[PDB]
Nucleic acid binder design. Structure first.
Ligand SMILES: [Mg+2]
Ligand SMILES: [Mg+2]
Ligand SMILES: [Mg+2]
Ligand SMILES: [Mg+2]
Ligand SMILES: [Zn+2]
Lengths: 52, 161, 196, 205, 190, 134
RNA sequence: GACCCCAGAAAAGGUGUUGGUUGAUAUAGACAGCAGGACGGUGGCCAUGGAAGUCGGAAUCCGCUAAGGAGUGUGUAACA
């Protein structure tokens, strides 16, 4: 029963993020490259999928 | 109080959309706590109450008796605020001084229940004792010995059967 | 095509200044494209409204300064979201009709609210299925005559606070007038003059 | 049941064409070498783009078919089915053999035909696309995608020739104007200033 | 390429004074004293005027990576000035679907107890960094106030609380419970 | 509010429809017409643009008046059974005719452009009947 | 990482850094940020159970304009 304003606050840290397609890393929503060495900083990123 | 109001509104819109009109054969279907058509409480602990019961005990603290209980219900529920210090009802949210006033439901119905719950859950022996005397409840043996949540069950079960 | 668009703007402003010697500088508030078209039709008979880049204007005026002096008074004034309206009519007639053709702009979520609004205690006339919006705002409503009724006045939006999405949908739901604003006359130019 | 292409990547043998000595060759997988609007006139598609190999190697007929389809699908998507014309400029004329193992061993080890490859040289053109000027970025991307079907290293080039002709695009139009070139379908015919004068009188009339 | 000179200057307000011990900046303001040394960065720090108190950071013959340290130092010093004049105040909201998160502030705002996070019996005890004080605000029902002079310590304390209330073995897109940094502001609001 | 506010529009046209239409769904807004009222409403509206007929209605407590706004696709498809410049011209007079126009010539450009669903070279070199309409 | 034979590597990637090529924008105010607008015909046509810019097949216009695609994506049964 989280109110919408708090619900957006939690989703800022849990949901509004990008995911590396090679190494699944959790990245900030404006990311263009992965920050991780093990994938080679690939630009192959996808949005984190919503529960919607 | 807000949780109670949202549920009452949700039930009302259900029985107003799918239901028939007020001028229908049944009459008025919409439920209102001021009418005493809705109760509160817990079935597991065996205690429940209505606006009817609390109007009865405040009339006793204060036919013609049934009439005075009825119009007391309309004052126990709603957006009407009871000043604790002044000791009188009011229609304004703020006092003439400017203090925000608690509504009647929380101030003189929920407050005794919250005080009872707080005292028993915090094991305040003196506070529970004086609350029992003020609420003039009877406590038989084999149940006065128990303490904590079972003591809360026994106390509430007879205060609000 | 961008170069031709800029040169066409320069020819437009220069010719329009030559033809019209009397004009208002007006600052545009948060006015929509509907709002600008509403003003444009209301003034279409006799006046003309020209808006654009400030740097477009200021460069054009400086180039035309030698050809037509006394325009340099506009130079330390064209700042912010402003434009001109050109007219051959009198100051008062332009001003009071431009203040009369205002618009009840809707309350957009995520925008500051200059005005303070408060809902009256009246039957909304809406069906008993829009109760969820009232519950989000915490407004205690009841069903009377088969329609939603507000039991008491609720102070909804204060002055100078951001309008929430739930408030914005409710304002657009009850259709009541929110804060409303249009274009406001910054100053004047009566053949080389400055007034209020 | 085909071997990895790494087993036939390099031009190790002499050319082994299908002839009266090599018989029983299965048909190459690629049978279509021109796609799009092959019937378009010469002046409709003035831009030409090539995929050019940088390695002396062998490209299988399977790979040429895969890259032909890959470039065709992208060109159709971004330019329509009549906005381009593609020509695969490699033909798989070299037969590769296989010595099939279950006599046992290397005795009598000369193999049977397995497939066909095209032998490509450094600087040789593998594939060509001709189209209008405004589709230059689409040709580059289509050829870039088709590079992934080939083993070696390939470069995308935008030729200075007009379409599929052998004449420069900066002198093509005025040669047509002065009748040094005459269109004939997708290409042009070069008319030199020698021969019977009756051909010259056929022109200029 | 090695740039000849890359420099940047910060302005120090009147009520705060900055003292330099080589590459150790000491910022002393009304709210206290902050120290931070940048001996890991090879730069030239200098105080310019007695009139307006400018601090200048120079980097001579720097490549791409070590030209990025000039703005970093200037921003760290500006955070130091901001901390000793206005202070740092990170607000935190505790959100929950069902189980209210109970926060108890132990000795002098240095220890934080999270009791009923997602309804479990384990009690989290998060200790704030030295110089950081946590409190429960009286303006919101579920809000924590972290106050201190060093931004590094205040935000690290807020991150300690945030990472303490972490959901495990569940779908965190659905289970949104926890305490999150709601806004990052100052004290004294100037 | 004129004792009734039923200005909500309708998106049916041509055939009577009745039960097959959305009028049973949106009927409780006034609760007066129901199956009889939408039938008499459509009886007068079956002609006059047998197309989609995006229309607006007003209720007089038993009967309705169904004014059909002049939608460009409606009138062009209705007048179709070619330049027909005079035919479209005569249809642009009783229109709402606002169009954020400056001259009457802008309106005929707008619907000459709408009928592109070629009638575009007319818009390009247009010189005839610019001020003919007013 | 580190020297013929030679004793281990490829396609493909990198907003790590370095150099080079070509192109484009910009004091007529680039770029990035923050802040406003993002309109009418028109809920354009054919499609259908509903597709209103955003499942699709074609079209691809005009006026007001500083500008606004009969639409880049998210979203809705469709709207919003
Ligand atoms: Mg194998
Ligand atoms: Mg051999
Ligand atoms: Mg910063
Ligand atoms: Mg699980
Ligand atoms: Zn990664």
């Amino acid at each position: 029963i989280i109110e919408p304003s708090l619900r957006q606050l939690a989703q800022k840290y849990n949901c509004d993020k990008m995911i590396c397609r090679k190494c699944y890393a959790r990245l900030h929503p404006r990311a263009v490259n992965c920050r991780k060495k093990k994938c080679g900083h690939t630009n192959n990123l996808r949005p984190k999928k919503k529960v919607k | 109080y807000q949780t109670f109001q949202r549920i009452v509104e949700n039930v009302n819109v259900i029985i107003s959309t799918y239901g028939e009109g007020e001028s229908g054969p049944m009459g008025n279907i919409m439920i209102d706590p001021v009418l005493g058509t809705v109760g509160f409480g817990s079935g597991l602990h065996g205690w429940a109450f209505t606006l009817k019961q609390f109007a009865e005990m405040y009339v006793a603290k204060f036919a013609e008796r049934a009439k005075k209980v009825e119009d007391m219900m309309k004052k126990l529920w709603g957006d009407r605020y009871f000043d604790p210090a002044n000791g009188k009802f009011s229609k304004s949210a703020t006092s003439p001084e400017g203090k925000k006033l608690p509504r009647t439901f929380c101030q003189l119905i929920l407050d005794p229940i919250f005080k009872v719950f707080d005292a028993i859950m915090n094991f305040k022996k003196e506070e529970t004792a004086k609350l029992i005397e003020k609420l003039d409840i009877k406590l038989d043996s084999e149940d006065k010995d128990k303490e904590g949540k079972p003591l809360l069950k026994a106390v509430m079960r007879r205060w609000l059967p | 095509d961008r170069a031709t668009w800029k040169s066409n703007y320069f020819l437009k402003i220069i010719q329009l200044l030559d033809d019209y010697p009397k004009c208002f500088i007006v600052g545009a508030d948060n006015v929509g494209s509907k709002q600008m078209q509403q003003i444009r039709m209301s003034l279409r008979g006799k006046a003309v409204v020209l808006m654009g880049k400030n740097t477009m204007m200021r460069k054009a005026i400086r180039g035309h300064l030698e050809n037509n002096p006394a325009l340099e008074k506009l130079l330390p004034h064209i700042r912010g979201n402003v434009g001109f309206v050109f007219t051959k009519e009198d100051l008062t007639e332009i001003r009071d009709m431009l203040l009369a053709n205002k618009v009840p702009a809707a309350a957009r979520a995520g925008a500051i609210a200059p005005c303070e609004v408060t809902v009256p205690a009246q039957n909304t006339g809406l069906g008993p299925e829009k109760t969820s919006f009232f519950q989000a705002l915490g407004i205690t409503t009841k069903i009377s005559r088969g329609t939603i009724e507000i039991l008491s006045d609720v102070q909804l939006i204060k002055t100078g606070d951001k309008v929430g999405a739930s408030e914005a949908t409710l304002l657009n739901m009850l259709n009541i007038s929110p804060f409303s604003f249009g274009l406001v006359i910054q100053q004047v130019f009566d053949n080389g003059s400055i007034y209020n | 049941g085909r071997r990895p292409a790494r087993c036939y990547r390099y031009c190790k043998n002499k050319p082994y064409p299908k002839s009266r000595f090599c018989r029983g060759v299965p048909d190459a997988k690629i049978r279509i070498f021109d796609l799009g609007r092959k019937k378009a006139k010469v002046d409709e598609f003035p831009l030409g783009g090539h995929m050019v190999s940088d390695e002396y190697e062998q490209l299988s007929s399977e790979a040429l078919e895969a890259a032909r389809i890959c470039a065709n699908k992208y060109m159709v998507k971004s330019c329509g089915r009549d906005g381009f014309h593609m020509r695969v400029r490699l033909h798989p004329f070299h037969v590769i053999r296989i010595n099939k193992m279950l006599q046992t061993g290397m005795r009598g080890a000369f193999g049977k035909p397995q497939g066909t490859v095209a032998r490509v040289h450094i600087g040789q053109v593998i594939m060509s696309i001709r189209t209008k000027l405004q589709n230059e970025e689409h040709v580059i991307e289509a050829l870039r995608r088709a590079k992934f079907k080939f083993p070696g290293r390939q470069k995308i080039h935008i030729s200075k020739k007009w379409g599929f002709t052998k004449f420069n695009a900066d002198e093509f139009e005025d040669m047509v104007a002065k009748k040094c070139l005459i269109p004939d379908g997708c290409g042009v015919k070069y008319v030199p200033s020698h021969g019977p004068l009756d051909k010259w009188r056929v022109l200029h009339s | 390429m090695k740039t000849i000179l890359s420099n940047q200057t910060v302005d120090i307000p009147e009520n705060v004074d900055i003292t330099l011990k080589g590459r150790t900046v000491i910022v002393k303001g009304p709210r206290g004293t902050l120290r931070r040394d940048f001996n890991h960065i090879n730069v030239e720090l200098s105080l310019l005027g007695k009139k307006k108190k400018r601090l200048r950071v120079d980097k001579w013959w720097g490549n791409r990576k070590e030209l990025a340290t000039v703005r970093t130092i200037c921003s760290h010093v500006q955070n130091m000035i901001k901390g000793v004049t206005l202070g740092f105040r990170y607000k935190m909201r505790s959100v929950y679907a069902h189980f209210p998160i109970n926060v108890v502030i132990q000795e002098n705002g240095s220890l934080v107890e999270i009791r009923n996070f997602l309804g479990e019996k384990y009690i989290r005890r998060v200790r704030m960094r030295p110089g950081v004080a946590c409190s429960v605000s009286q303006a919101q029902k579920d809000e924590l106030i972290l106050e201190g002079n060093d931004i590094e310590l205040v935000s690290n304390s807020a991150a300690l609380i945030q990472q303490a209330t972490t959901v495990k073995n569940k779908d965190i897109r659905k289970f949104l419970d926890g305490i999150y940094v709601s806004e990052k502001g100052t004290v004294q609001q100037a | 509010p004129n004792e009734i506010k039923v200005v909500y529009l309708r998106c049916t046209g041509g055939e009577v429809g009745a039960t097959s239409a959305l009028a049973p769904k949106i009927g409780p807004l006034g609760l007066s017409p129901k199956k009889v009222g939408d039938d008499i409403a459509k009886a007068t509206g079956d002609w006059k643009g047998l197309r989609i007929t995006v229309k607006l209605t007003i209720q007089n407590r038993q009967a309705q008046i169904e004014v059909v706004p002049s939608a460009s696709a409606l009138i062009i498809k209705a007048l179709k059974e070619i330049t027909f410049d005079e035919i479209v011209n005569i249809a642009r007079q009783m229109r709402h005719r606002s169009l954020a126009r400056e001259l009457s010539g802008t309106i005929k450009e707008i619907l000459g452009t709408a009928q592109s669903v070629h009638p575009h070279d007319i818009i390009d070199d247009i010189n005839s009947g610019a001020v003919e309409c007013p």
